[PDB]
Design a protein around this ligand. Structure first.
Ligand SMILES: Nc1ncnc2c1ncn2[C@@H]1O[C@H](COP(=O)(O)OP(=O)(O)O)[C@@H](O)[C@H]1O
Ligand SMILES: [Mg+2]
Lengths: 55, 66, 371, 55
C-alpha cells in the first residue's frame, strides 16, 4: 500500500546502519588486538635482550 | 554539514509513519464498513423494486391478456 | 525575495521555490504539434501542447523532446517550455525572482551561453546562475566528499569530489541513459510480437520499463532461470486492453547499463566507469571515494541496482577497501533538493550573475569567475 | 496478512543481531586497548631497568 512501504524503508535504514556499525566495530577490534599482540611481542624481545645483557 | 541529516530524517522517521498509519486507519474505517452497509441497503431497495416490478407486470399481463 | 530553482533535465522538468523539500511542479518536457487535419470548428484547438497537457492528448500529437543528450537542439521549443514552466505551473513572473538552472558536465559552451542570454533577454530575470548537476546531488546527501553517479535520462556522468575540491580531470561522461534504455526495450519487445513505432507509443514503452523492469543481481543465472521456469513473466495492461506478458525482457533492458555493447556502444558499463573515474584520482583519497559512492538521477531507481553495482565494484576494487553505495529513497529529486539547499545558503548569495554584470561583458560572462 | 509479519520480524532480528555484535566487538576493543596501555607502561619500565643494567 502506502504507509507499509515507508515503514519497511525505515526498518531497512535501521538494518543498514546497524550492520555497518557492527562491521566497523569488528574491524576496530581486529586492528586493536593486532596492535596489542605486536606490543606484547616487542615486550618479549625486550625481556630476552635484557636477559642477554644480564648474562 | 551532516548535522541536518538528523533534523530532516529522524523527524519523518516517526512522524510520517505514525501519520500514514493514522490516515490508513481513518480511511479504512470511513470507507469499507460504510460501503458494505450502503451496498446492502441498495440491495434491499433493489429487491423491493424487483417485487414491485413483478407485481405490476403480472397485473398488467392479467388485464391486457385478450 | 525567494529564488526559483529550475532544473531543465531531459525528460522531466522539475521546478519549485528555494527552501522546500520537493519540486512544486514536475511534468514531462515534450512539445507536440497536432498532426491530423481537424474538422470541428471553434473547438479551441491550440497549435502546440506542452508539458503534461500533451501527455493526455498524445493520441493525435507528435511529441518531440527539445533536449537530446543534455544539450538543447531546438531553442524555440525550449523557450516555450520555460515560458510554460514560469507562467502556468508556478504562476510567478520571472521579473522578480532569481533563477538557478542546472547543466550537465562537459557540455558545449554555446548551449550555456544561449541559455543565459535567453534568461536575461526574453524572461528578463534579475540574476541567474548555472550549476553542475552532480555537485547539487552531493549537496542533497549532506556529504562533502564522494563520487556521484548521476544517471539521468539524457546523459550519465560521474563527477568525483573530495573535501569540496572537484577533480576536473576525472569526470567521465557517458551518453547512455534512460532514453537509450527505452529505445532498446522497444526494440527487444518485438521478439514477442508487440510492435511500438509511433512517438506516442514510446511513452507506453517507457511506462512498461518503469513499472516492470529490474536489474538482475547475476545476469547468467537469471537468463538460465527465465528460460526454464515461468515465475518471472509479469503481465501489463495496455491503454486499451490486450494485456502483454514480459518474459526475460524484464532484466535485459536495464542490463544495458552494465554492458553497453548491447546497443552497440563501445564503452564500459556504469560499473566500470566509476572504478576508472576513481583510479584517475590521487592515491590518498581513493579510500574515501570508495566508501562514499553516491547514486542519483532517475535511471538509478531500478529495483536491485544498489546491490549489483556494489558487487561489481567489490569485484574490481582491492579486497581491503570497504565499498558502500549511498542510495537515498529520494533519488529522483536529489539534484533539485540539492539545488534548493544551495540556493538557500547565505554564503552563496553573492555568486549570482547580476544583470548589470551581463550588460557589461555579454553572455560570455558565464565562463568567467561567476561560473 | 502473512508477508508483512515475517519480513518485519526478520528485519528487526537483523538489526538486533548487528547491534549486539557491535557491542561485543566494542567491549573487546576497550579491553584490548586497556591491556595494550598496560603493556606500554610496563615496557617503558623494562627499558629503564635495561638501560641501568647496560650502564
Ligand atoms: N521508478 C522508476 N524506475 C525506473 N526508471 C525510472 C523510474 N523513474 C524514472 N525512470 C527513468 O528515469 C527518467 C527520468 O530521469 P530524470 O532524473 O527525470 O532525468 P533528468 O536528469 O533529465 O531529470 C525517465 O525517462 C525514466 O526512463
Ligand atoms: Mg538530472
Amino acid at each position: 500500500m502506502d504507509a507499509i512501504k515507508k515503514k519497511m524503508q525505515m526498518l531497512k535504514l535501521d538494518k543498514e546502519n546497524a550492520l555497518d556499525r557492527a562491521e566497523q566495530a569488528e574491524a576496530d577490534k581486529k586492528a586493536a588486538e593486532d596492535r596489542s599482540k605486536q606490543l606484547e611481542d616487542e615486550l618479549v624481545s625486550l625481556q630476552k635482550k635484557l636477559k642477554g645483557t644480564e648474562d | 554539514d551532516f548535522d541536518d541529516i538528523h533534523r530532516k530524517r529522524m523527524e519523518k522517521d516517526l512522524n510520517e509513519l505514525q501519520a500514514l498509519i493514522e490516515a490508513h486507519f481513518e480511511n479504512r474505517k470511513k470507507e469499507e464498513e460504510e460501503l458494505v452497509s450502503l451496498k446492502d441497503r441498495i440491495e434491499r431497495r433493489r429487491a423491493e423494486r424487483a417485487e414491485q416490478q413483478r407485481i405490476r407486470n403480472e397485473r398488467e399481463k392479467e388485464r391486457q391478456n385478450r | 525575495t525567494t529564488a526559483l530553482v529550475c532544473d531543465n533535465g531531459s525528460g522531466l522538468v522539475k521546478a519549485g521555490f528555494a527552501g522546500d523539500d520537493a519540486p512544486r511542479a514536475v511534468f514531462p518536457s515534450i512539445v507536440g504539434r497536432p498532426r491530423h487535419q481537424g474538422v470541428m470548428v471553434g473547438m479551441g484547438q491550440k497549435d502546440s501542447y506542452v508539458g503534461d497537457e500533451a501527455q493526455s492528448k498524445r493520441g493525435i500529437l507528435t511529441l518531440k523532446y527539445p533536449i537530446e543528450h543534455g544539450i538543447i537542439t531546438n531553442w524555440d521549443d525550449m523557450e516555450k517550455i520555460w515560458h510554460h514552466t514560469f507562467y502556468n505551473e508556478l504562476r510567478v513572473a520571472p521579473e522578480e525572482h532569481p533563477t538557478l538552472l542546472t547543466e550537465a558536465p562537459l557540455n558545449p559552451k554555446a548551449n550555456r551561453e544561449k541559455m543565459t542570454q535567453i534568461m536575461f533577454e526574453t524572461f528578463n530575470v534579475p540574476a541567474m546562475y548555472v550549476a553542475i548537476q552532480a555537485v547539487l546531488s552531493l549537496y542533497a546527501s549532506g556529504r562533502t566528499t564522494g563520487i556521484v553517479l548521476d544517471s539521468g535520462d539524457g546523459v550519465t556522468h560521474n563527477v568525483p569530489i573530495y573535501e569540496g575540491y572537484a577533480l576536473p580531470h576525472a569526470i567521465m561522461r557517458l551518453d547512455l541513459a534512460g532514453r537509450d534504455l527505452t529505445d532498446y526495450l522497444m526494440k527487444i519487445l518485438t521478439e514477442r510480437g508487440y510492435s511500438f513505432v509511433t512517438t506516442a507509443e514510446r511513452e507506453i514503452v517507457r511506462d512498461i520499463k518503469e513499472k516492470l523492469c529490474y536489474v538482475a543481481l547475476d545476469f547468467e543465472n537469471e537468463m538460465a532461470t527465465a528460460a526454464s521456469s515461468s515465475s518471472l513473466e509479469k503481465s501489463y495492461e495496455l491503454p486499451d486492453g490486450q494485456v502483454i506478458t514480459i518474459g526475460n525482457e524484464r532484466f535485459r533492458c536495464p542490463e544495458t547499463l552494465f554492458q553497453p555493447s548491447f546497443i552497440g556502444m563501445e564503452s564500459a558499463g556504469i560499473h566500470e566507469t566509476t572504478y576508472n573515474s576513481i583510479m584517475k584520482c590521487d592515491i590518498d583519497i581513493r579510500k574515501d571515494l570508495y566508501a562514499n559512492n553516491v547514486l542519483s538521477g532517475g535511471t538509478t531507481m531500478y529495483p536491485g541496482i544498489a546491490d549489483r553495482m556494489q558487487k561489481e565494484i567489490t569485484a574490481l576494487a582491492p579486497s581491503t577497501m570497504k565499498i558502500k553505495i549511498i542510495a537515498p529513497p529520494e533519488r529522483k529529486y536529489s539534484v533539485w533538493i540539492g539545488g534548493s539547499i544551495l540556493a538557500s545558503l547565505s554564503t552563496f548569495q553573492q555568486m549570482w550573475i547580476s544583470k548589470q554584470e551581463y550588460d557589461e561583458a555579454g553572455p560570455s560572462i558565464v565562463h568567467r569567475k561567476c561560473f
